Amino acid sequence: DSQIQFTRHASDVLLNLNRLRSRDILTDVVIVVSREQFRAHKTVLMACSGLFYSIFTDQLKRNLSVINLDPEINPEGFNILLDFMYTSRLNLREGNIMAVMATAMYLQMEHVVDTCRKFIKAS
Amino acid sequence: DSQIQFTRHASDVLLNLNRLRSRDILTDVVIVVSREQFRAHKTVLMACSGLFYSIFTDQLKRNLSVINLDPEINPEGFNILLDFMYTSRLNLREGNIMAVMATAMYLQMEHVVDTCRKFIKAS
Ligand SMILES: CN1C(=O)CCc2cc3cc(c21)OCCOC[C@H]1CNCCN1c1ncc(Cl)c(n1)N3
Ligand SMILES: CN1C(=O)CCc2cc3cc(c21)OCCOC[C@H]1CNCCN1c1ncc(Cl)c(n1)N3
Ligand SMILES: [Cl-]
Ligand SMILES: [Cl-]
């Protein structure tokens, strides 16, 4: 393990990917959540969600430009998790815990799911 | 700053992007370095290199699938930096410092450049 470790590099990369998303640069998919639409990078969604990973790894589904989620999926809960994917920061509150946990479970985000379980234990 | 911070999330994302690159999943550019070719994600290259950021932010150059570097650019030095971009780990040695520093300077990777300067000061 002779290589030099840059402790800030991963966070710097994520910050710049979020800036790319903010500027709509090289976004290649739209996630439709009821009346709300969210543009993103498939590479990012696959890197953070078991649901999106299982969809785009399949060469048949790889080129999809639009994804539609379950109508019982809360748009604000998806937005909080889309923000998490791009920032490492989760907006967890007692007023949104159940919607956020239901959305993370659906999206197969094991660590968010684990944190939601810890939040409840601490609530 | 009420949001929960996931200290491992950024590194997890980068690890999965490197796995995507390893599996040639959603790669969209080839960087030609003399007789060597390297496939990657433009979003990743832009997030790590001033050179690649300046190229793909320009809507005229955004859709380029092939980039050719200066013939004096060392393929092993580019490979070490491409690995760095995707891992946060830099393979710096006295036997490759000058080639790696010349390549980072060319690619406009200020932090790699800074570390190379610190390595020399410590060498
Ligand atoms: C379930 N799941 C979560 O709960 C958290 C987030 C997450 C991210 C991904 C996939 C996930 C999940 O579910 C599929 C199972 O994991 C496969 C993993 C492990 N074996 C090596 C390859 N893997 C991989 N390689 C590339 C990507 Cl981009 C990736 N996983 N993405
Ligand atoms: C020179 N340079 C380096 O030396 C290190 C790596 C690096 C990464 C990028 C661009 C770089 C560099 O050079 C252009 C100047 O920086 C622009 C920055 C700062 N103002 C906010 C927006 N910025 C930004 N936003 C998105 C991306 Cl994807 C990005 N930068 N990439
Ligand atoms: Cl997660
Ligand atoms: Cl850098």
**Pairwise CB contact (< 8 Å): B3 & A44:** no
Task: Classify domain A1-123 by CATH architecture.
Answer: 2-Layer Sandwich (3.30)
How many angstroms separate the CA atoms of A29 and B10, rounded? 21
How many angstroms separate the CA atoms of A21 and A27, rounded? 6
Give the 3-state secondary structure of residue B33: strand
CA B43 to chain centre: 11
Instruction: Compute the C-alpha angle B79/B84/B85, nearest 5°.
Output: 100
| Ligand whose nearest atom lies closest to the CA of B105 | 2
Question: Residue B40 phi/psi, 5° resolution?
Answer: -160, 180
- A-interface mutation test, from B8, B24, B80, B88, most A Cβ less than 10 A away: B88
- The label of the residue with tokens 């002779």 reads A2
Where b means 16+ CB within 10 Å and e means fewer, A82-100 reads bbbbbbbbbbbeeeeeebb
Give the 3-state secondary structure of residue B36: strand
8 A C-beta contact, residue A18 and residue B123:
no
**Pairwise CB contact (< 8 Å): A6 & B84:** yes
Tokens of A80: 């909080």
Q: Which amino acid, one-letter code, is at B17?
A: L
For this experimental structure, what is the resolution in angstroms?
Answer: 1.8
How many angstroms separate the CA atoms of A16 and A19, rounded? 5
- The label of the residue with tokens 């393990």 reads A1
How many angstroms separate the CA atoms of A78 and A31, rounded? 9
Instruction: Compute the C-alpha angle A78/A84/A51, nearest 5°.
Output: 55
Which experimental approach was used here? X-ray
Question: Residue B88 phi/psi, 5° resolution?
Answer: 75, 10
Best of B52, B53, B62 to mutate for ligand 2, by most ligand atoms within 8 A of CB? B53
Cα–Cα nearest to B63, from A22, A28, A26, A18: A26
How many angstroms separate the CA atoms of B122 and B6, rounded? 34
- The neighbour count for residue A43, using CB atoms within 10 Å, is 26
Q: Where are the domains of chain B?
A: 1-123
Cβ contacts of residue A51 below 8 Å, gap of 6+?
A106, A107, A108
8 A C-beta contact, residue B38 and residue B77:
no
Q: Which amino acid, one-letter code, is at B123?
A: S
